[PDB]
Symmetry: D2
Subunit: 385 residues, 4 copies
């Protein structure tokens, strides 16, 4: 009624990266919040409103599976619907239409606050911030990174019930394979929570046991992980590489050498996902921020604490696309799949998001060949950058 | 040597698709491939506005264009017009194609090719004699009264003039095929075409040295049964390079899908174009036969097609949008593979340092922005 | 009853296994395990380093071992064809009943249904090749019997779909209107003996046809750049297709091209006749005299009337003359035909829980024996 | 020459692994020391005597690029032509027809003795022991392994001249990328010596510099190398993997976990070579041997000195083929290439050795599908096991 869902409109004069094809000479019709039609550009009804993308690129909006903050805010430091709204709006400037608010190692009280804020946000917004990613606290202090040792712990039976009871707003939990909490991996998976390995010093065998129990993701590969340290000690890194699970990797050139990403892409193929792991530094100009009481300084696109340990990243998805194409040498269409289609599959939202197919949600990103985002559509709502 | 740079382009090198790079031209050569932010500040830049840059296209079968036909006006001026017309659709090199007709015109065409080559490099490269040593059953629009078998005198003439003859298309069942080893030894590419030969007779010609096949499917014995594979089957079941027309009228797009799957990096795109390409005409004459031009189709009185009205950049669009070949692979079918098919790939057909700066810039709706020929840039 | 095959290279359809044993339990594949883990007291068949794979499935087979299903419509014929098949590694097949009067078709349905009350996973179901063909591509099929289906015969076939696996018909025959009806009833529809244009053949595929019968043979070919025919529609499609690999029906070079295009959709069939696995000089095939001279079956005019080849002989030719790798060739004889007719959940590959229909063979392509429903019999 | 005159014969009833094809129904004709023809088996000239391989496999003879000893002898301990003859004869029992005698970290005098012995051996034998592999002494103390710290050193200009002057009998030198000796890599390469990286704790950058200066091989990947220890520290292992050089790897399941081999094969493709790194225990039944003053014990397939340091391998090429096929999961035809064709390419003898093609040398191995060697041909001369 009254065109509440909007007039139908069409993107024209774009190269369309659908995830399965690269389309030339086609137009993309949006109807309400859905991708309506993909048709020859000269068959678009003359009465449709048209967005002329001037020969640039159009793809499904990026999905960022690990995001602690951006645009000057941190979810841990300000647990509110407003923070989530700010992060969503900031993400659009870099082509990211959905994300997982990532809430790291901290007391039980804030975790329950996070659950309340997520459920409140989800009464108002769909297909944007999708669900919580609890990164910690059930980690290993030997691979704590910037996480506070005093909060790294094993799960109580009551907290296990709490998280299972609230699985409808929890997309992912990152935990250590050797933490006693790994006993509950089948319980989490049964409730629909993605279990991901991270901040873990486990051996190869112990990591594979957690994968066997149902862990299906690995959090920022190489960072805070036991590595392949010898021919006979493969660690969490080797376990993740020598498996079929999806894995996230940061492509800022600072967390992981581009050479390592080249190797990891050859091994992992269509199971390697790009995440930002971004902080308040991303999409803003700041000199420091607070991360669960620890001050993280921002200098030269590096986010590090006073001892030089990296605490998140300052990168965005479209910047990550550019680095993967230009420095890692991944072809553009495959790089895009690592930012939309593969993360969608990794958390099981791919029936409605992550690729350009008729009937899926019109979450979309337009971008140039020098990797500037021109605009986004979220639920069919186009907003130029 | 004048130096300048192309910037703000996606560069298709034939081996890579480069983002964030610049291309530096020095005289007639590709001098450097650099991060765009490392271009020396004293170089003028051509800003390609985010569009595409690739090696200039090479058209291995081109009868005419821009309203002229090489058979009808055998002159250096004709070759100059064809070259100038070709630039508008991204084609920086071509083989002037001279079809079935009497000996005297063939000798004129050799004289004109030599005169052209006293002046021009890396443009019209050398003659493609298409015929007359063909078969009458697969003549197409070629004149039956001129289809013949070669005399020892004309065999000597052609080998004596191999310095300006790039390719000869002949029929595998024509007695002229006995001379395939002679032609190849003199440096002439032998192409199979206009031939009704059996599979076995075609395979014999390939074994003797034929290394190309002329507009696959058109004027060829087909695969007519499980047991009769003909010339088409011999070409497909071989390692030879093959040309194909991608106008959607000479060959069904589904046939091109199959042939690409079989032939991979041996399938080249040719236009086989006529006076109608790059012009707005309704008919033209082709060795005395009028050929009508209607809706991109060139056909004679019987509806036999006589060449095409297509260009290389239009063929690129059709291969990408109708056949489903990826852009970078389609471009290779228009520059890198034809370069290799005729042995000019050491200097042309790909973007690498030290090769000739024959370049084509084009948009994603397949309009050519301009070309460089021997490093000299001209916007369309 | 439990036993294991040991000392074999096991082609499972997904992997080529070395150092493993295959345990059979009753009629099922029970376990695949390291050979040194097989208990001492478990009975073992030692395959002496030779090859083991899922039994072959022949989707087009008119007769063999001296008998023709059309000519001798009986359960005994199907038993003879099955036991003959085992000698060349073929554990399941579709009895193929060609273009002939309605009454014989009804006889075949009765016989097939009676056979299936006694035998499982062997002769699977009928292949009716014709009569709804075209006279321009009749081959040895009798022109007088090629026809368009009546509403009464359409009802009979759909009523008896429980024993009809496949129907081969021509895309330009008016019978093609009923392709969705046949498909809804569980009958595979295959294109064959058809002079259709590309467009009319693609129309039949869009309507539900999912197979093509002996590619190149009795089909309109790709006759030009612009006329792709039935051959072109099948190749430029995602449907399964059968091909004969006897070197007489189709040039090996054509099979090379067809394999390059169709990949995992190209299935090997024998299209064999009474001459396969027998020593006869001629036979009559629906009134047509077919002479047998050194492995070629042809009528007086020289038209091929079926083949004298077996599946293991086709494997050899596919490997040695076409150049297809052994593991891929075997898939064209078990896994891909199982998928083409929808029995791949129980047959066609070596996976735990599937039926133990198995074939053991040497590297010069002699069959050492078979298991059918787990029951091993050496050649 | 009162040895047997070279004649013509054929192998029939074999599956032939040529390195480019797997042939069924073919025969292989030998003429003198050359592969003469590959023909349909029915077309074999009827006058020829025929070896019937009874349906088993036939491939080019294996080339072992790292071999310290076998059959009860160690080249370091008995620097003699007789030692090289015993190793070659022992090698035949496991399908290996060529090898590089490996001489480890030792004083200059022994190195000069080895050059002397290698040159005299090559006056008598072709296509067998091909030339020396000097593994050390220009290594690093931090990754010395079983090599004596007191002998690890940097090369003098006189010893550098000696090695370069004798490059005609030296196939390969393994050195550490951070050893000052690495400055001479271009000199060694210009003289025709393969430079391999090994026993090196170098950073990724220093290792890539050595590769840039001409190093084209890496010695037993993972073993005695700096690993990829984090996202930002890729070490020698990462430099080798993220390059196009050939590298050798031990496939005994004890030096390198099979999962690591899986990963390295996915990364390296046709650049990964199998070596044995074997010792006097290979092809013998001994409980110990001496290796430059140290007793090395043979226990449960392991070779280790009294303090438990690994000192070579007890594995043969055919056993490694079995492990690569059954434990790593590499297809048989690709596994064979890692044992003949790729090592041939790695040291530049592929024009004459390493594959079954007409005109190449008839160095051949016949083996069963339970990976027992039935026999070999060396320079066309067949000898059954
Ligand atoms: Na959830
Ligand atoms: Na020439
Ligand atoms: Na059925
Ligand atoms: Na040397
Ligand atoms: Zn973390
Ligand atoms: Zn022509
Ligand atoms: Zn038939
Ligand atoms: Zn070592």
């Amino acid at each position: 009624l009254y065109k509440k869902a909007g007039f139908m409109y069409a993107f024209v004069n774009a190269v369309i990266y659908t995830a399965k094809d690269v389309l030339y000479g086609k137009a993309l019709v949006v109807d309400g919040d859905k991708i309506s039609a993909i048709l020859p550009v000269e068959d678009v009804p003359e009465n449709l409103q048209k967005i002329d993308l001037q020969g640039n690129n159009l793809t499904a909006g990026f999905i960022d599976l690990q995001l602690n903050g951006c645009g000057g805010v941190m979810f841990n430091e300000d647990i509110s619907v407003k923070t989530l709204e700010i992060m969503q709006e900031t993400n659009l400037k870099s082509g990211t239409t959905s994300y997982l608010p990532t809430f790291i190692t901290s007391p039980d009280e804030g975790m329950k606050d996070a659950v309340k804020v997520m459920r409140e946000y989800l009464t108002q917004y769909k297909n944007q911030a999708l669900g919580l990613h609890f990164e910690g606290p059930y980690l290993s202090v030997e691979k704590k990174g910037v996480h506070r040792e005093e909060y790294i712990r094993a799960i109580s039976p009551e907290m296990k019930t709490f998280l299972c009871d609230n699985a409808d707003v929890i997309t992912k939990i990152t935990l250590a394979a050797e933490n006693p909490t790994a006993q509950y991996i089948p319980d989490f998976v049964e409730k629909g929570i993605i279990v991901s390995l991270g901040h873990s010093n486990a051996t190869y065998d112990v990591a594979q046991q957690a994968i066997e129990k149902g862990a299906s993701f690995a959090t920022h590969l190489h960072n805070a992980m036991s590595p392949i340290s010898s021919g006979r000690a493969m660690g969490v890194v080797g376990a993740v590489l020598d498996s079929d699970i999806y894995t996230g990797i940061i492509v800022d050139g600072l967390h992981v050498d581009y050479g390592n990403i080249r190797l990891d892409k050859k091994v992992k193929g269509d199971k390697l996902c790009i995440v930002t792991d971004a902080t308040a530094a991303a999409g803003a100009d700041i000199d420091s921020f607070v991360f669960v009481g620890k001050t993280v300084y921002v200098r030269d696109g590096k986010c590090y604490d006073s001892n030089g340990t990296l605490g998140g990243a300052a990168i965005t998805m479209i910047e990550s696309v550019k680095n993967a194409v230009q420095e890692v040498g991944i072809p553009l269409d495959e790089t895009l799949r690592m930012c939309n289609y593969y993360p969608a599959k990794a958390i099981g939202v791919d029936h409605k998001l992550g690729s350009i197919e008729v009937g899926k949600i019109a979450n979309l990103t337009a971008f140039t060949n020098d990797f500037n985002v021109l605009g986004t559509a979220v639920n069919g709502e186009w907003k130029a950058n």
